[PDB]
Amino acid sequence: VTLGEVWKRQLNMLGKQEFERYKVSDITEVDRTAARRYLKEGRTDVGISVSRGAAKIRWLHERGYLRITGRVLDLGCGRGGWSYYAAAQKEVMSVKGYTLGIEGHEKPIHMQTLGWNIVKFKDKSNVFTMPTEPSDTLLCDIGESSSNPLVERDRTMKVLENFERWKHVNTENFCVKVLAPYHPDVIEKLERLQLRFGGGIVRVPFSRNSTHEMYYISGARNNITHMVNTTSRSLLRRMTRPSGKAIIEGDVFLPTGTRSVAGTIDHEALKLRVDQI
Ligand SMILES: Nc1ncnc2c1ncn2[C@@H]1O[C@H](C[C@@H](N)CC[C@H](N)C(=O)O)[C@@H](O)[C@H]1O
């Protein structure tokens, strides 16, 4: 019924070569070659990003869709790509990342990119059921794809409901993955959230054409139905005429080091934190 649902049915009918060509058509992509090398080598002395996901948050932040400041919460942090990016940012004071890190889920990776000392990770943590805590900036990149669009609908709904559960009065800045934005139920939820919290929905150009994912963000106001329909039409237009060519951009490289921005650096506690990771 929706253009998004047409997109998804068509996506899963594409051949091997066709799917691969389509997936990258006209998208933006970071070259991960260097980072992947240092990660297999196991270096912790190079300021690399632990995942391709850091490119998405960098785009949102640099474009001005999201201010990243104060106490940052990262729900579903995985390896920690968004957490480490946030920690490196001038106005950020602390970062707390929570993730499952159980079988078949990514655990947080230890890295020493700038502000690694103000990042705390906790795995074995289900963000849908655990106690909440305040944040000035609330990030959530949760939304696992499925061949069943109704499963994706329900997953997206859960993410948006849990966002509202975590959001505090001071949570002025936010960025929440919307896995399957085109379902009428999801549009309705987002419209109702927007009525209370403002914000808007955006498509990140680093997202592959094989996902309809969009991000509910604090830093822009727009028409939800319009933005979603525009993305559906773009994905369908790219499918009819696939370039097979991505725009390559430089990876998220960060400086390394600790940040002092009340207490002096507790290197003894830091070692133990790193030991546990
Ligand atoms: N209920 C949950 N509680 C905690 N973590 C979850 C939950 N559901 C999914 N996850 C994790 O959410 C993560 C979503 C990832 N896309 C995050 C990537 C991350 N932003 C990065 O840049 O590396 C996965 O690692 C899942 O294991």
Side-chain angles (χ1 to χ4, degrees):
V1 181
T2 66
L3 290 181
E5 287 167 78
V6 169
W7 162 84
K8 192 191 175 62
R9 70 143 98 110
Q10 290 176 188
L11 180 73
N12 289 149
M13 288 190 274
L14 290 167
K16 338 72 52 56
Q17 268 76 294
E18 276 112 36
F19 176 87
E20 289 300 316
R21 184 193 179 93
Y22 173 61
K23 185 166 65 174
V24 300
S25 292
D26 297 339
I27 75 171
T28 316
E29 214 173 62
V30 290
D31 197 310
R32 288 291 288 162
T33 187
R36 284 166 177 178
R37 164 198 158 177
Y38 296 123
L39 285 166
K40 55 172 170 277
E41 193 181 318
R43 286 207 158 259
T44 55
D45 66 341
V46 185
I48 47 95
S49 161
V50 299
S51 74
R52 194 185 274 288
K56 299 191 206 174
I57 193 90
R58 185 182 61 178
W59 186 86
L60 286 174
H61 183 43
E62 292 187 352
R63 284 295 229 255
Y65 287 108
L66 167 81
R67 185 179 288 276
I68 309 181
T69 189
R71 184 165 169 205
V72 174
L73 269 177
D74 190 7
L75 310 185
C77 68
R79 290 182 200 182
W82 285 24
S83 288
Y84 286 113
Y85 179 81
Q89 302 313 308
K90 292 179 194 295
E91 302 312 324
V92 172
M93 298 188 70
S94 68
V95 183
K96 189 64 190 279
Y98 291 117
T99 208
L100 288 170
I102 69 175
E103 161 190 272
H105 292 265
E106 297 278 1
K107 287 173 163 182
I109 292 179
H110 167 60
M111 202 54 56
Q112 299 178 297
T113 44
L114 187 66
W116 64 269
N117 67 121
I118 68 159
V119 178
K120 294 171 170 181
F121 290 114
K122 186 180 185 169
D123 69 343
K124 283 88 81 188
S125 295
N126 185 346
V127 303
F128 299 151
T129 58
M130 65 183 289
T132 73
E133 72 192 77
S135 60
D136 305 290
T137 308
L138 181 59
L139 313 172
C140 178
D141 192 30
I142 298 163
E144 186 190 341
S145 290
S146 170
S147 68
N148 186 332
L150 272 40
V151 167
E152 297 189 324
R153 177 195 61 188
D154 289 350
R155 285 178 184 170
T156 306
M157 288 304 286
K158 186 72 177 175
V159 168
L160 297 176
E161 290 159 1
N162 182 63
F163 163 68
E164 208 183 339
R165 189 177 80 87
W166 274 82
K167 196 188 197 290
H168 280 61
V169 294
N170 72 313
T171 316
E172 289 174 31
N173 312 294
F174 54 83
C175 177
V176 186
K177 184 180 182 176
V178 189
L179 173 66
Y182 49 81
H183 295 275
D185 287 347
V186 175
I187 297 285
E188 190 188 44
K189 187 63 179 182
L190 282 165
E191 278 172 345
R192 290 192 199 282
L193 290 172
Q194 191 176 233
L195 284 178
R196 302 188 75 212
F197 309 125
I201 198 164
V202 66
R203 172 63 174 200
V204 183
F206 290 88
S207 293
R208 304 250 257 252
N209 297 328
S210 46
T211 173
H212 206 302
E213 70 194 9
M214 296 181 74
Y215 288 82
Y216 176 45
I217 44 80
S218 51
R221 286 187 167 112
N222 56 38
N223 184 304
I224 300 306
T225 296
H226 177 71
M227 295 312 294
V228 177
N229 290 343
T230 301
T231 297
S232 291
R233 289 191 295 271
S234 167
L235 295 174
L236 288 170
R237 175 185 152 81
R238 286 169 180 197
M239 205 182 282
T240 66
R241 305 162 181 271
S243 68
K245 295 178 194 298
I247 299 159
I248 315 296
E249 291 197 0
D251 200 5
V252 184
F253 302 121
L254 299 156
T256 52
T258 56
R259 284 183 65 215
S260 57
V261 176
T264 53
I265 301 152
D266 188 351
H267 281 288
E268 298 174 297
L270 262 63
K271 173 197 169 282
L272 302 171
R273 185 193 298 174
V274 172
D275 286 353
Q276 208 188 333
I277 295 158

